[PDB]
Amino acid sequence: HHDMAGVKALVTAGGTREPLDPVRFIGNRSSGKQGYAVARVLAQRGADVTLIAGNTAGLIDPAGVEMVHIGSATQLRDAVSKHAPDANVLVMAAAVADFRPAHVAAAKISSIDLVRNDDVLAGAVRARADGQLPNMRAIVGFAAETGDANGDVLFHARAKLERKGCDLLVVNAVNDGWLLSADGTESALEHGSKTLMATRIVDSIAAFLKSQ
Amino acid sequence: HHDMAGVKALVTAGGTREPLDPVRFIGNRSSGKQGYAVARVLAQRGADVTLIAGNTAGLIDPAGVEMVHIGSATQLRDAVSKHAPDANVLVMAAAVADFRPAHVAAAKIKKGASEPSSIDLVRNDDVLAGAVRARADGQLPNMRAIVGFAAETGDANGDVLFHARAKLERKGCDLLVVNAVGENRAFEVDHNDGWLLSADGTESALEHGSKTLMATRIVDSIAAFLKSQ
Ligand SMILES: Nc1ccn([C@@H]2O[C@H](COP(=O)(O)OP(=O)(O)OP(=O)(O)O)[C@@H](O)[C@H]2O)c(=O)n1
Numbered sequence: 389h390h391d392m393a394g395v396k397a398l399v400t401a402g403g404t405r406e407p408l409d410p411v412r413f414i415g416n417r418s419s420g421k422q423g424y425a426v427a428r429v430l431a432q433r434g435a436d437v438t439l440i441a442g443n444t445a446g447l448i449d450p451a452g453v454e455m456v457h458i459g460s461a462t463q464l465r466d467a468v469s470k471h472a473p474d475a476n477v478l479v480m481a482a483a484v485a486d487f488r489p490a491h492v493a494a495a496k497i498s499s500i501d502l503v504r505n506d507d508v509l510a511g512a513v514r515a516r517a518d519g520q521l522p523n524m525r526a527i528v529g530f531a532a533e534t535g536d537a538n539g540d541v542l543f544h545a546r547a548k549l550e551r552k553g554c555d556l557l558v559v560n561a562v563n564d565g566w567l568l569s570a571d572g573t574e575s576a577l578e579h580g581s582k583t584l585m586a587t588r589i590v591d592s593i594a595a596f597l598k599s600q
Numbered sequence: 601h602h603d604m605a606g607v608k609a610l611v612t613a614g615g616t617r618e619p620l621d622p623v624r625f626i627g628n629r630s631s632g633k634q635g636y637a638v639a640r641v642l643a644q645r646g647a648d649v650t651l652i653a654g655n656t657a658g659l660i661d662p663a664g665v666e667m668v669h670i671g672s673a674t675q676l677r678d679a680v681s682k683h684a685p686d687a688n689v690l691v692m693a694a695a696v697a698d699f700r701p702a703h704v705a706a707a708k709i710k711k712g713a714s715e716p717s718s719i720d721l722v723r724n725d726d727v728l729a730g731a732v733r734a735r736a737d738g739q740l741p742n743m744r745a746i747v748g749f750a751a752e753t754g755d756a757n758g759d760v761l762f763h764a765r766a767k768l769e770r771k772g773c774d775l776l777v778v779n780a781v782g783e784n785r786a787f788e789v790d791h792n793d794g795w796l797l798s799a800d801g802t803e804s805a806l807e808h809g810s811k812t813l814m815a816t817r818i819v820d821s822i823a824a825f826l827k828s829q
């Protein structure tokens with residue numbers, strides 16, 4: 389019940405907000421609950437946990453977890469970069485905005501022109517492959533996927549795993565979901581409480597660290 | 601005493617979210633707490649309160665208050681149209697989005713490879729102003745007080761009071777609550793631009809204090825207006 393002792397774990401959770409001006413922004417409907425649950429379970433099993441949190445459903449800080457609060461995707465990126473060097477597990481559970489307004493208004497206010505934000509998960513994946521994160525043992529991504537006219541849900545999920553290159557892709561089929569490993573393993577994630585699904589996610593992380 | 605006994609009160613609170621697709625939206629940073637505080641105080645003082653709530657999911661429903669939930673500024677508009685005939689006082693405390701994306705995608709907008717397009721905006725209707733016009737056209741015979749809220753700063757073209765007076769005159773509501781702001785917490789600056797501006801010219805200061813104390817002063821302001829009539 390304490391296998392993650394000595395693990396430094398960095399978790400992102402919640403959705404980011406891309407400011408239009410001091411008051412208005414682009415946001416999403418993500419609750420952050422599953423990222424917090426992974427943070428709580430990680431800490432419960434002995435990890436030294438840092439939680440980078442964007443916008444959440446009123447969530448209370450998990451006890452024993454270092455909280456770092458952020459607003460935008462770019463602030464998330466800098467937060468991930470700042471806390472990256474000593475971490476052994478990166479759990480990218482945040483819904484990071486792909487786009488942000490190019491211009492932020494100085495005062496209270498046409499169209500909003502967009503510019504792309506950095507892909508932090510892929511930045512972490514690339515940094516580790518070029519030797520800049522030797523302590524990083526597990527990079528975990530999240531995806532909310534669905535079947536559509538261009539493929540079924542699981543096709544899209546596999547393609548996302550292949551494209552991101554992370555060690556584990558936790559897939560939420562928008563009732564059951566999936567855990568896709570980079571060695572090809574696929575486990576169904578049965579629908580239950582946020583805590584029990586977090587246990588299955590952390591169990592998979594612990595299983596990956598031992599194989600390596 | 602219980603001065604708002606027999607008053608039917610319709611309160612809007614929180615910010616709206618204007619969908620870009622099922623997941624993304626345009627939103628603002630309004631907590632909705634000052635609007636809940638006015639409703640709870642109204643209810644505590646004997647009003648029959650109906651609360652139309654925007655983005656306030658982690659807030660607790662005020663005791664004794666009929667809850668109506670909405671998402672976008674447009675759904676707020678339709679909720680106000682439905683519930684306005686039962687109200688004697690309209691308290692427009694919601695942070696209504698001024699603009700809405702022109703097209704709502706049926707699916708999550710994927711991050712592709714070509715240049716990201718732009719978000720076309722379209723103005724939302726002024727719900728408070730729609731209410732002021734309805735009362736003027738005879739469609740709201742029960743409506744006794746129309747209350748608006750505004751966050752006003754002082755920019756290059758006037759101080760808070762200039763912009764606020766212009767807003768009250770322009771909106772046509774009976775009372776304009778200006779800069780009912782802050783939770784009075786440590787290290788939060790007080791700029792003393794709090795005001796209750798009536799459509800008869802009276803200007804009273806709104807001191808910055810707790811959400812409950814500003815709610816009490818606002819309802820006090822409402823009750824004084826109902827007595828004048
Ligand atoms: N700018 C971004 C966006 C994504 N994420 C992370 O990347 C993972 C994949 O998220 P997803 O949105 O599904 O990937 P996308 O490439 O953005 O997929 P799509 O374009 O279909 O939305 C998540 O763990 C998320 O936290 C990230 O680190 N940086």
Ligand SMILES: Nc1ccn([C@@H]2O[C@H](COP(=O)(O)OP(=O)(O)OP(=O)(O)O)[C@@H](O)[C@H]2O)c(=O)n1
Nearest residue numbers: 692693694696724725726727728748749750751
């Ligand atoms: N589309 C809108 C705009 C605002 N409101 C209401 O009207 C009041 C005015 O808010 P404010 O944003 O300050 O007024 P605006 O006309 O939008 O002024 P501005 O463009 O400077 O923001 C508030 O009570 C708000 O709930 C509304 O009913 N519908």
Ligand SMILES: O=C(O)C(=O)c1cn(-c2ccc(O)c(O)c2)c2ccc(-c3cccc(O)c3)cc12
Nearest residue numbers: 418419420421422423482483530531532559560
């Ligand atoms: O932590 C949360 O709950 C949360 O807010 C989430 C935000 N994303 C997310 C990521 C990238 C996106 O592009 C996007 O749109 C959303 C999630 C993706 C999957 C899960 C998940 C995983 C297993 C079981 C399960 O039930 C939910 C949770 C979230």
Ligand SMILES: [Ca+2]
Nearest residue numbers: 484485486711
């Ligand atoms: Ca995305």
Ligand SMILES: [Ca+2]
Nearest residue numbers: 695696697698
């Ligand atoms: Ca406005």
